[PDB]
Every structure is written in C-alpha cells, then in structure tokens.
C-alpha cells in the first residue's frame, strides 16, 4: 500500500531487522550442522606427499596427497584412507610416520 | 613441605590423559585432594576418581 | 539342551567390552539371537551386531 504524503525517517545502520537477520542466519546454520557427522576420529597425523598428477605452475604445493589410519564401523578396526587435501586445510606436524594434521584439530 | 594437619590430604597423581590426536596420549601429573580419590587395587595404578 | 527348532537360533558370543575406565577392557560373553548378529570375517572374531 503506497502512503501518499507520508515522509518517514529511515536509518539503515540502526535497523534491528539486520540484527535479527544475522541471529536467524547463524541460528539456522548451527541447527543445520548440529545433527551431522563429527570428524573428531580423523584428528590424526597425516602422511602427505605431492600430488602425482600434472600440476600447473600456480598449483605447486596447493594440493597434497595425504594418507591416514581412520576408524571404521567397528571400534576395534582401522582402515588406511587416501585423500587429497588443500594446503590451507592442513598444517605441518612432527611425528613418527606423519607430516601434517588438520588445521582445526 | 606439608604440616601435620595436611598429611594425606593431597596426592601427586600421574596418569595418561588424552590429547588433540585420537591415537596419542599425554603423560601428565596433577595434584588431587584426597576426597576426590578412591582406592583401586589394579596392577599399576593406585586410585581412580570418585565419580568415574 | 536345545530343541530341534532352536538349533542355531541362539549363539554364545564373547567380546572385548569397554569398562568405566577408558584404558581398560573386560572380556564378557552373552547370548544373542541369530537375528541380532551377522557373519563377519576376521582373525579372532566371526560376527558383528546387525545394525552397526
């Protein structure tokens, strides 16, 4: 409904709709991720080497071929898993038979 | 240096704590109050925490 | 003493159970129905719980 002859003072930086939108987006984000698989069993050292595929000049060291001993469906078993991680997702670590670990662990 | 009133009230307890990595363990020492320590016989360890 | 219609219906299964202490295990056994477990191939074990 257009309001003819109605002048209203606005202030976009004092608008509480922004604060509500912010809180609603964060809350929905957390609600979405809460009932999901946690990766705490993967906070182990990784044995990482250079990717053996053809690497362009700008991808040298960006992506690494990492391997680790992950848990399985059963508590008493382990499996060796190979995966490619971006350098940004791993950090150097000194260990016996490993080179890197996940940045957030 | 422990006075007579505090004999047996504190113990220097060694244990293998978990750490950031799932398959690593961190050997640590801590001082616990006697009221928080309950005896166990075991073979290597001497006590466990009262609520475990 | 198992009757003719119960042969293989119930199994006596042993396993390494956890305990109230993280660094100790208890060897236990229990009777499971065949419908609760499925065959598994391993060095020391031969069944797992059907839903795991």
């Amino acid at each position: 409904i257009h309001l003819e002859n109605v002048t209203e003072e606005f202030n976009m930086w004092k608008n509480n709709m922004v604060e509500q939108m912010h809180e609603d987006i964060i809350s929905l984000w957390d609600q979405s991720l809460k009932p999901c698989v946690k990766l705490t069993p993967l906070c182990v050292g990784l044995q990482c080497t250079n990717v053996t595929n053809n690497i362009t000049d700008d991808m040298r060291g960006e992506l690494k071929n990492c391997s680790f001993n992950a848990t399985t469906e059963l508590r008493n078993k382990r499996q060796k898993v190979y995966s490619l991680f971006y350098r940004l997702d791993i950090v150097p670590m000194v260990d016996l038979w490993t080179n890197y670990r996940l940045i957030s662990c | 240096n422990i006075t007579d009133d505090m004999r047996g009230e504190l113990k220097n307890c060694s244990f293998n704590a978990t750490t950031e990595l799932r398959n690593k363990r961190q050997k640590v020492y801590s001082l616990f109050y006697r009221l928080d320590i309950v005896p166990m016989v075991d073979l290597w360890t001497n006590y466990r925490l009262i609520s475990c | 003493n198992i009757t003719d219609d119960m042969r293989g219906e119930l199994k006596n299964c042993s396993f390494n159970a956890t305990t109230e202490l993280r660094n100790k295990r208890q060897k236990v056994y229990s009777l499971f129905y065949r419908l609760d477990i499925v065959p598994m191939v391993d060095l020391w074990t031969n069944y797992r719980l059907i839903s795991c």
Partner: antibody, heavy 132, light 113 residues
Framework: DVQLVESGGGLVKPGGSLRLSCVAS????????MHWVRQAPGKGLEWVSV????????YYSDSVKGRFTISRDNAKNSLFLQMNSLRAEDTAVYYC?????????????????????????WGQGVLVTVSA | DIVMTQTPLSLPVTPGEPASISCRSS????????????LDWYLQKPGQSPQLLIY???NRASGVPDRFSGSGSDTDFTLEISRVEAEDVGVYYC?????????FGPGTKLDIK
C-alpha cells in the same frame, strides 16, 4: 644382552642384487623400530632406511630410494634388506640397529605410545662391495 | 632440507683433560609438540661399529660414562667430555632426530695428543 648379527654380504657386480639379513636376539623384535645405516669406506655414517614394527610404514633416505627395499619377519626375529641396481657408490659396511620402543595399547582404544632412545644397540656390521 | 655440520673436524686432546665437540643444524631441531629437541651423539671406535653415547640433546644412554654430557640450543649443540682417555677417542657423529628422515653430519675425529 641385546644382540644383532648381520649376514649375507660379499662382492656383487654393478647392476646386480643382494639381500642382507640381520638376526636379532635378547629383546622382543616386534616391539622396536628397525633401522639400516651404511658407512662407505673412507666416509662417515649414512642413514639408509627404517621399517616400523608391523612392516606397514617404511621410509627410505632419498639417496637409497628405489634401489633398496626393507622388510622384516617378526616371527623369525629377523630383518632383511634387498638391494637392487647397486652402484659403485653403494660399497659400504651396512649395520642394522634397534630404534625406539613402540607400543600399541589395546585396552586404551588401540592408542599409540613411543619412547625414543636414538639408534640404541648396533650390530656387528656386514660388508657389501659393488665392483667389477 | 636439513643438514648437519661440525666445525672441529680434528680435535687432538691431552689425555685426561676435558674437550668438547660442537655441532650446528641448518634448521631448528625443537619438536613443538612436546618442547623436546631430538639430537643423538654417536662414537665409532676404530674397527668397531658405532655405539650410542647421547640420545636427545642431554639424555645419557645407559652404559655411557658420566663424563659425557650434551647441551645445546635449538640449532647450536655441544658434546662435552670432562676428561678424555684413550677409551673415549675415535670418530664422533652428530645425528639429527626431529623429522623422520634421519641424517648424520660429517663427523669429527677425536684423538690423543
């Protein structure tokens, strides 16, 4: 009384192959890391390679990758090193050593413990000569 | 990428007097996971396989006389012997032990004047 005795050395022509065997006694073989180190005549010590207790994790020095393969048999309490495509630069006395103590704590969710002691006990040494 | 060097390649010492063998790493050998520095010292007597003298920067190996003592910073290390006898001379090697790819330095010859 920790003992390590190497055998299987001798003279091999360049391009051939030779397998050394280190027999250990006095300790549980499956509990310790095993290392090979070599010393060329007139040179200092050169680290060659290490094999884990299970044999699942193997690492070689860059100078010996490809040409050397390390393996072990815990039931027989012995360590093997298979050399291929030997070069004149590979003439050396080879030694096997015991590494640190590695333990898998089964009760503690198969946790890993390791105590390092350097290269600990060293063997007698076996000479491999590459020449023709 | 990590190498070891030793300045005193020839260090004759009067028997019965103290001596020390220095060693430098091209990179820090400190392990940030536990704060320990991993560096071993070995001695190869003529005609014998090398034996372990010191494990880690300052931990003496069992069976080693108490006269041998290691010390050092993350990159600058010294092995000191309070008195050197004929039984304590031969070729010394500095071995890095932080990263798994272990290497040895050029070594030094300790002898008797």
């Amino acid at each position: 009384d920790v003992q390590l005795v190497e055998s299987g050395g001798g003279l091999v022509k360049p391009g051939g192959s030779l397998r050394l065997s280190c027999v250990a006694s006095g300790f549980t073989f499956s509990s310790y890391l095993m290392h090979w180190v070599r010393q060329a005549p007139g040179k200092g010590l050169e680290w060659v390679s290490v094999i884990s207790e299970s044999g699942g994790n193997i690492y070689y020095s860059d100078s010996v990758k490809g040409r050397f393969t390390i393996s072990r048999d815990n039931a027989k309490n012995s360590l093997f090193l298979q050399m291929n495509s030997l070069r004149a630069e590979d003439t050396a006395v080879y030694y096997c050593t015991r590494g640190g103590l590695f333990h898998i704590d089964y009760d503690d969710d198969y946790a890993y413990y390791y105590t390092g002691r350097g290269l600990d006990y060293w063997g007698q040494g076996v000479l491999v000569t590459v020449s023709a | 990428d990590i190498v070891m060097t030793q300045t005193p390649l020839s260090l004759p010492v009067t028997p019965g007097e103290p001596a020390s063998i220095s060693c430098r790493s091209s990179q820090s050998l400190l392990n940030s996971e536990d704060g320990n520095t991993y560096l071993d010292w070995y001695l190869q007597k003529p005609g014998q396989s090398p034996q372990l003298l010191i494990y880690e920067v300052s931990n003496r190996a069992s069976g080693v006389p108490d006269r041998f003592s290691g010390s050092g910073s993350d990159t600058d290390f010294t092995l000191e012997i309070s008195r050197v006898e004929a039984e304590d001379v031969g070729v010394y090697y500095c071995m890095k032990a932080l990263e798994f790819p272990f290497t040895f330095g050029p070594g030094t010859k300790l002898d008797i004047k």
